[PDB]
Design a protein around this ligand. Structure first.
Ligand SMILES: *[C@@H]1O[C@H](CO)[C@@H](O[C@@H]2O[C@H](CO)[C@@H](O[C@@H]3O[C@H](CO[C@H]4O[C@H](CO)[C@@H](O)[C@H](O[C@H]5O[C@H](CO)[C@@H](O)[C@H](O)[C@@H]5O[C@H]5O[C@H](CO)[C@@H](O)[C@H](O)[C@@H]5O)[C@@H]4O)[C@@H](O)[C@H](O[C@H]4O[C@H](CO)[C@@H](O)[C@H](O)[C@@H]4O[C@H]4O[C@H](CO)[C@@H](O)[C@H](O)[C@@H]4O)[C@@H]3O)[C@H](O)[C@H]2NC(C)=O)[C@H](O)[C@H]1NC(C)=O
Ligand SMILES: CC(=O)N(CCCCn1ccnc1)Cc1ccc(Nc2ccc(C(C)C)cc2)nc1
Ligand SMILES: [Ca+2]
Ligand SMILES: [Cl-]
Ligand SMILES: [K+]
Ligand SMILES: [Zn+2]
Length: 805
């Protein structure tokens, strides 16, 4: 019930929300069917339109007008945005030359430059170039301010997940808005686009920017706009709020546009119908900037022009139907479209089996346009699993396609030409970022970055301490002229042991053998030097990784590689080695094929054993530093130490062996040498965070050797590839991956072919940021470089995407 008989008289677009049954006058009351009876008349005036014309100049104020051209309008804060232009000989903001904003130029009583977030739904990154002719205001913001070529959205590349990631700095699995549609089994409640459930606060986790601001004494405009409020009214409402007295005036505001997403769905991303929507957004930007100029705020306000996701060409004829795959189609519920999520239709049906559903969906047709995954097998860069609202079974849908349950769903639910939702690495889903204002840099282009980073910067722009989130605070310092956040490196928690030779060979009873007895002060001085770290500078280029949790581990030096060996997990946490452009690949000699060697620096009790691998019929083993890359026959023996060995399913060894034998050398060739850090990851509860030992669900049979869920590598070289990786004077270049450690290659439909046809494609799909590896390992990389710490944070958030330009 709402007592709609109250009135909006002097309450139009009020900032405090009133609770039922009192009637509302705020910018969301329409959406709730709760506005006062006189809201339209009072608050949504339209008379005479939105622009001053010469004849209205100095009019007598008529309060019926949508906006005003009378002399008192600047004091009242409610002129038409073109008032000064038409009536006072002023120029439109877009016509003025740009001039650097070195310091905020604000009216008296402004405590800080306000922040205005101008968000545009469906605004694809390439519209900045392709549409540039018809967007002069947006083009001026972009060229005069700070801009990225694109900004990466979160997965799924849907509206609400992305807008709420913008507002919180959190992945969707952590903020809880994991799609535009959801079922929460604990609430037994469903969230949808249409309806009222979605307004219930229990869906919405984390702490969005408006709440962060309010808790710390910074007032916020209400960010959400009901759809029938016209854009011109939204802009005039923001500008009016900006004329409130100091004590009442918000410092942060948002505007939202349903365009260009609305028309992109109907016409496709580049339909000729798309020009008009882009012109219209531009005109809205021009209204805002003109309105700020009138208020003397155009060199005071920081403006962020930001999109949520792009738009791809997708048509009804490109739908895959689960009825072409599953016999039991009526026993499942599908969340359909540009992603798939599958769960059981009834929890009372115990003949529902996810394994047989996955199998029926796996590489069943030559051209199949979606790939099924248990959510924990999805690429870790998507961070899309650790939420009860995310169904165990997921379908990653190819760009340009939909998945649906049955054909009748597509014509009794073509009607559309664009859609979005796909993998957040897809070019068509990339969106835009421009920052313009005193706090942003002048005419500066910055590299693409991820939208989870923006919340931190929005907090910096408003002098707020960000709530805990998934941005890496400091990684976007290079966007800002001032207000940078000067992070310190985390403190190492565990210091390493440096074991010398402490064990005789016969103390080990590991069931390992090696043909290594084939056997000098010239050479013997040298090997001692190597075991004490004499080549450490060559193989450990950026310092040892810091261990940021409590653990027991040893640093182990060798000719060709250095490792941080965990006595708790019985394997290295990290292995570090450098491969020059000139390095040679060799084979594993015939006599050494099954060689494993006890490491006399590490107790038997803290070593793996070969008997466990013999007894475990499913599990084999691999090496972190690859024997193929040994610098010499004698050095090669180091690669077979039991302390360089890790458990690997045979299927995964096909992947690993190809990476180590072929690809590392290819990279050293292309990049002028590479430094590699490889190691295991254990994320059995799929939370993106390192597992403690009591979370491990699987061990090599009969032993305490834990089995990794994933293997990572960080591959660093010099950004200026004219310098070799080990003598780089400036910025670095990095690519990384987190490969899932699986007992089959069912993910790779071409896996029966030679590794050269499928392995690198797998690795590309599992590309990662150094930062993703840091969360999964509790390690901190790049601690000793000649680079600024902020620049290193940016490197650590880098994702190498493999998309074309
Ligand atoms: C991205 O950034 C985010 C934010 O920094 C990172 O997420 C954080 O990770 C922390 C570590 O996992 C986690 O800390 C836990 O918090 C528990 C208290 O949680 C409540 O309070 C906070 C603070 O306001 C609030 O934010 C939480 O909100 C969550 O929950 C509701 C849903 O219930 C949602 O509205 C919201 O969306 C959010 O959900 C997300 O997180 C939860 C987990 O909290 C997931 O279940 C969801 O899927 C969703 O992703 C909460 O309202 C606290 O109680 C925990 O402490 C337990 O564990 C420690 C171990 O050290 C132990 O000391 C304690 O005793 C306790 O154990 C007890 O519970 C156990 C499990 O139930 C049980 O086994 C034991 O026997 C004990 O009884 C813990 O400290 C923090 O909450 C989240 N924060 C957020 C916002 O998500 C995220 O990790 C980053 N991602 C990456 C990859 O880096
Ligand atoms: C009410 C409603 O349902 N919508 C969404 C329609 C989805 C349509 N759609 C479906 C498929 N494709 C497109 C409208 C909406 C959205 C955001 C918003 N304000 C806002 C501004 C800034 C921010 C961040 C940037 C801080 C967050 C929120 N006001 C209104
Ligand atoms: Ca974990
Ligand atoms: Cl969805
Ligand atoms: K075995
Ligand atoms: Zn859309």
């Amino acid at each position: 019930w709402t007592a709609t008989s109250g009135s909006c008289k002097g309450r139009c677009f009020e900032l405090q929300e009133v609770g039922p049954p009192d009637c509302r006058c705020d910018n969301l009351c329409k959406s709730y069917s709760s506005c006062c009876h006189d809201f339209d008349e009072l608050c949504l005036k339209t008379a005479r339109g939105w622009e001053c014309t010469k004849d209205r100049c100095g009019e007598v104020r008529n309060e019926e007008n949508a906006c005003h051209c009378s002399e008192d309008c600047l004091s009242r804060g409610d002129c038409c945005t073109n008032y000064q232009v038409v009536c006072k000989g002023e120029s439109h903001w877009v016509d003025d030359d740009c001039e650097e904003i070195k310091v905020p130029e604000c009216p008296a009583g402004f405590v800080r430059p306000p922040l205005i977030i101008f968000s545009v739904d469906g605004f694809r990154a390439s519209y900045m170039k392709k549409g540039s002719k018809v967007m002069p205001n947006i083009e001026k913001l972009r060229s005069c301010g700070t801009h990225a070529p694109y900004m990466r959205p979160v997965y799924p590349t849907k509206t609400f997940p992305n807008l709420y990631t913008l507002a919180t700095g959190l992945y969707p699995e952590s903020h809880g808005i994991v799609g535009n549609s959801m079922y929460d089994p604990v609430f037994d409640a469903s969230f949808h686009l249409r309806g009222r459930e979605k307004f219930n606060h229990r869906w919405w986790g984390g702490q969005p920017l408006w709440i962060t601001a309010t808790k710390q004494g910074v007032r916020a405009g209400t960010f959400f706009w009901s759809v029938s409020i016209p854009h011109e009214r939204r802009i005039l409402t923001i500008l009016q709020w900006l004329s409130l007295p100091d004590n009442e005036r918000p410092s942060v505001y948002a505007f939202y546009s349903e365009q260009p997403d609305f028309s992109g769905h109907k016409y496709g991303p580049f339909g000729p119908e798309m020009t008009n929507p882009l012109r219209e957004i531009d005109k809205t930007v021009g209204q805002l900037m003109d309105g700020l100029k009138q208020l003397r705020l155009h060199r005071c306000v920081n403006v962020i022009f930001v999109g949520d996701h792009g738009m791809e060409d997708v048509t009804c004829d490109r739908t895959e139907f689960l009825s072409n795959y599953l016999t039991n189609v009526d026993d499942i519920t599908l969340v359909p479209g540009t992603l798939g999520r599958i769960r059981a239709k009834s929890i009372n049906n115990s003949k529902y089996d996810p394994k047989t559903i996955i199998a029926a969906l796996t590489c069943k047709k030559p051209d199949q346009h979606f790939k099924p995954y248990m959510k924990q097998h999805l690429p870790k860069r998507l961070h899309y699993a650790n939420n009860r609202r995310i169904e165990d079974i997921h379908l990653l849908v190819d760009r340009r396609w939909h998945v649906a349950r049955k054909p009748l769903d597509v014509y009794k639910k073509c009607f559309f030409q664009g859609d979005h939702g796909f993998d957040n690495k897809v070019n068509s889903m990339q969106t835009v970022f421009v920052g313009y204002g005193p706090t942003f840099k002048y005419r500066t282009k910055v590299p693409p970055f991820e939208n989870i980073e923006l919340y931190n910067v929005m907090c910096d722009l408003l002098g707020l301490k960000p709530a805990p989130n998934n941005g890496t605070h400091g990684s976007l310092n290079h966007l800002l002229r001032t207000n940078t956040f000067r992070p310190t490196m985390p403190d190492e928690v565990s210091r390493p042991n440096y074991p010398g030779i402490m064990y005789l060979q016969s103390e080990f009873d590991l069931g390992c053998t090696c043909d290594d007895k084939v056997e000098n002060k010239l050479e013997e001085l040298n090997k001692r030097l190597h075991t004490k770290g004499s080549t450490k500078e060559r193989h450990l280029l950026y310092g040892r990784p810091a261990v940021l949790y409590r653990t027991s581990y040893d640093i182990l030096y060798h000719t060709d590689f250095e490792s941080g060996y965990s006595e708790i997990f019985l394997m290295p946490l990290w292995t570090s080695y450098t491969i020059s452009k000139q390095a040679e690949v060799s084979s594993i000699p015939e006599h050494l094929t099954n060689c494993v060697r006890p490491d006399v620096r590490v107790s038997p009790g803290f070593s793996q054993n070969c008997l466990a691998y013999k007894n475990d019929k499913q599990m084999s083993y691999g090496f972190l530093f690859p024997p193929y890359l040994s610098s010499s026959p004698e050095a090669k023996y180091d690669a077979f130490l039991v302390t360089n060995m890790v458990p690997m399913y045979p299927a995964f060894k096909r992947v690993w062996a190809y990476f180590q034998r072929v690809l590392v050398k290819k990279y050293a060739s292309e990049r002028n040498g590479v430094n590699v850090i490889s190691g295991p990851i254990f994320d059995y509860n799929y939370d993106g965070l390192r597992d403690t030992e009591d979370e491990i669900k699987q061990y090599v049979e009969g032993s305490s050797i834990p089995v990794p869920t994933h293997y990572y590598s960080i591959i660093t070289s010099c950004l200026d590839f004219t310098q070799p990786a080990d003598k780089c004077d400036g910025p670095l270049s990095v690519s990384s991956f987190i490969l899932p450690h699986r007992p089959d290659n069912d993910e790779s439909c071409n896996s029966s072919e030679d590794e050269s046809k499928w392995v690198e494609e797998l690795m590309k799909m599992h590309t990662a940021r150094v930062r993703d590896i840091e969360h999964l390992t509790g390690l901190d990389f790049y601690r000793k470089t000649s680079r600024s710490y902020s620049e290193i944070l940016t490197l650590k958030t880098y994702l190498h995407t493999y998309e074309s330009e």
